[PDB]
Write a protein that binds this ligand. Sequence first.
Ligand SMILES: Nc1ncnc2c1ncn2[C@@H]1O[C@H](COP(=O)(O)OP(=O)(O)OP(=O)(O)O)[C@@H](O)[C@H]1O
Ligand SMILES: [Zn+2]
Lengths: 116, 82, 127, 155, 51, 60, 26, 97
Amino acid sequence: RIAGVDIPREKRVVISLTYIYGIGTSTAQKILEEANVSADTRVKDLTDDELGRIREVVDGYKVEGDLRRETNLNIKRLMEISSYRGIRHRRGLPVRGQKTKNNARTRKGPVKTVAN
Amino acid sequence: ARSIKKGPFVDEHLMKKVEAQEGSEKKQVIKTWSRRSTIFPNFIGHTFAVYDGRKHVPVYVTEDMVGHKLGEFAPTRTFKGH
Amino acid sequence: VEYRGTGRRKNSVARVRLVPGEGNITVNNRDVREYLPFESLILDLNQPFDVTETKGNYDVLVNVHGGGFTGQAQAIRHGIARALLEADPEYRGSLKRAGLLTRDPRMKERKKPGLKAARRSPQFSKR
Amino acid sequence: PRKGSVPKRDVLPDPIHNSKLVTKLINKIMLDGKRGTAQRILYSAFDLVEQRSGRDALEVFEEAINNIMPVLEVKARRVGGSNYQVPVEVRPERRTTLGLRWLVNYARLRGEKTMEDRLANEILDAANNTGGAVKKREDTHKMAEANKAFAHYRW
Amino acid sequence: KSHYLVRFENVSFSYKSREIFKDTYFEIKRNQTVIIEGKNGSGKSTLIQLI
Amino acid sequence: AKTSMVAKQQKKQKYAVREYTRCERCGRPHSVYRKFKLCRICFRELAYKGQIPGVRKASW
Amino acid sequence: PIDAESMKDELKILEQYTDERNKETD
Amino acid sequence: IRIRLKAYDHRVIDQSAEKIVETAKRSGADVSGPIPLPTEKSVYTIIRAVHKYKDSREQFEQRTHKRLIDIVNPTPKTVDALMGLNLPSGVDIEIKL
RNA sequence: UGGGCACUCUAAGUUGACUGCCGGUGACAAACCGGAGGAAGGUGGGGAUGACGUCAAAUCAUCAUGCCCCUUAUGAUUUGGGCUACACACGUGCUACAAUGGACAAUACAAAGGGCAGCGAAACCGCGAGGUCAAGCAAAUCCCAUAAAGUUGUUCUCAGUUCGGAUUGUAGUCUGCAACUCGACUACAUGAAGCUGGAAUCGCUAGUAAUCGUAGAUCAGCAUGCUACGGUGAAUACGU
Ligand SMILES: Nc1ncnc2c1ncn2[C@@H]1O[C@H](COP(=O)(O)OP(=O)(O)OP(=O)(O)O)[C@@H](O)[C@H]1O
Ligand SMILES: [Zn+2]
């Protein structure tokens, strides 16, 4: 309603303004400086006085599809020039200098206990 | 990395032998060690032979390389599988 | 006509100054109930005042240094009581039976090497 | 220990209720070394309970630690193929250590929100012989009954 | 993978003249087995309806 | 090894990121103080004879 | 309640030992 | 007129200080009795083992003691003893005039 | 702060603690339990201090060296790579799974140590890491230095959540000839497994365990590690 995302109801407006991919809590409580809502009211209690005036800066940024494959291309260029990174994407490992002999279990799945 | 107020770093001889055939007929591969120098737009079209430790492995500089380092595109370790 | 006494406790040093007056205690430009955050410490640093049975006769007037709130609320009580065997030193039979003229030597302990603390060893696995 | 015995440590009364059964209940409540946030929970549950029930705050708490005082209990030996649990009688100062932790760890096991009132709903239910803490001088009181047979193996 | 399944908060109910439950508490935690008792007309099959 | 590597450390090297200390009694890179220029073996082996001023043990 | 007066009752049965039976012929 | 005293041992930092302050009390001038200042202990723990045994360490240290001396009435003949070099080879004095 | 050496602090000297004393169980004779002057009472509390030997334990790589080897090399100088590799199994830690918590505001109280081509204030600029100017201090004076827990408040109200902060894309700041393989920090977005742990297993008897913060040596740069330091501070020891 404020985007393709429908931020929930029964929530402070600056809380549910975190529900959108692309805006956390630093863009969620000075998004209320373009429009002017107290940020402490529930989303169940405001009219469309600001309900579009919060729908105007919500598009001033790049949000939820405007951003997702935005940063699937930037993690695609690193596969197509073939830099260092990306072969650590197009393998499945950690790409900065995170070290891989001991704790690398977010890039790699769960364990594969093998034979000793 | 380096900064805004410092420039990019290119190793002072990877430019002279590149801005020495500024206006020349062909491109022969350039023999390098400086894996550490950044890539300018100037290199666009070049294929350098960088050093990955034992062999000069060649890559040809294109226009999506134009913010990278010379040695991001030359492996140092070898790992086929366990 | 004020009495005198220093008492210490645990790296706090507090200089206390018994006067003739009514129940009230000022510490470092402040009322000690702004100084002290628990009602636990303001009950026993006037332990001297209920052992001798002179509950309200003095204004207190402390000067403190070092430590934290327990050791300062407790270096004091060794001032109130080492300024009252100085007024009537013949009070001294009974303010010393409640165990109130001990300095209380229990300080904080060296750290030892190859131990993670004073007395805390590292985790032992044998295989 | 082998060489003998020692003392305990003797704590001076509360400011307010004027017992040492409420200073030794903060030392069960305190944790990690923080007597700040244990004296909210213990003076905000004498007046979160003092509303609910119209008698004093300290006679509905002190009857809430005397249904919990286990009078018997089991201790162990071996045999050489069995290991029998003997029932022994409990001293007059160990029933006061256990009643005061059978009341404070049966409070983190409760489905209220803030431990002002877990400790508050547990001093008012335990005052009526019921609930958590005060079945456990009944867990612990059949085991000294089932084992009423092996009493002669005592010390 | 949690602690509590259902809960009551001073719940009451009534069948137009019959006052089945006054304010009561009820709880079922993860991996438990509850056995409700009573007699005929106590309110067992109407407690299961409140859930 | 030594007696080749120490005579390339008493020699001013190019970029001053490149002055590793390396003890001036024996030659050891490895645990070397600045106030003494004496590694952990030689501080204990010299402060025992008594030829390092003002030093004793500590027993606090 | 279990009525813990067993404290008064498991004190007579405490004294029939395993060796007290060995003695005291009938 | 402000002077400072140093030494690793205290035995020659009072054998010096309160030895020559009455080299000022010789003539007409009086000096403040020597004021001790906060002394320092440095400490260095090292490894006893020449090889693989942390957890067995050894500590040493080295102190420096400090002493204050200041006089209140210098004459033309109370600083002509400035070069009365008789201090026993360890002390280090600080004169700032 | 003018003036003062009282108070307390600094540190030299010198007091002090010995079963001296005093009851009564021991006549093996030592000792043991209790008591009263005391700040502390029974080797006060903690340290250094490690016998004869055991393990042909560890170290020829910090150093020295008997015997045997190499000597246009098994020696010597550079650039770049490597010790940072990742189906995996183990040892030590750290961060949490929240309501005795998150968040964001007012507000107190320690010590122990480092500091010259090195600490680096106040002012200004920056959402922030930090930048430009720059006083003072070879330092009980000045700087690092806010202690964070704590306390008074508004608030959120049991949900993988405002919990938790992995993993990534972005845009930056510093040091350095240079952070590409491979440094710390900060902004915005991303929002991973984790609801208190199977078999078994570990530390600790008092200002100790637990939590909380500060500080040093190595060091251009980089710590969750090691050696220190203090604030708040329990629970239990019947016995053998
Ligand atoms: N629709 C209704 N209107 C009015 N009263 C009702 C209604 N349904 C049930 N009751 C009353 O509620 C009471 C309890 O009903 P409930 O269904 O709980 O019985 P129960 O406890 O399940 O009995 P059983 O255990 O034998 O099944 C009964 O006494 C009945 O009279
Ligand atoms: Zn050496």
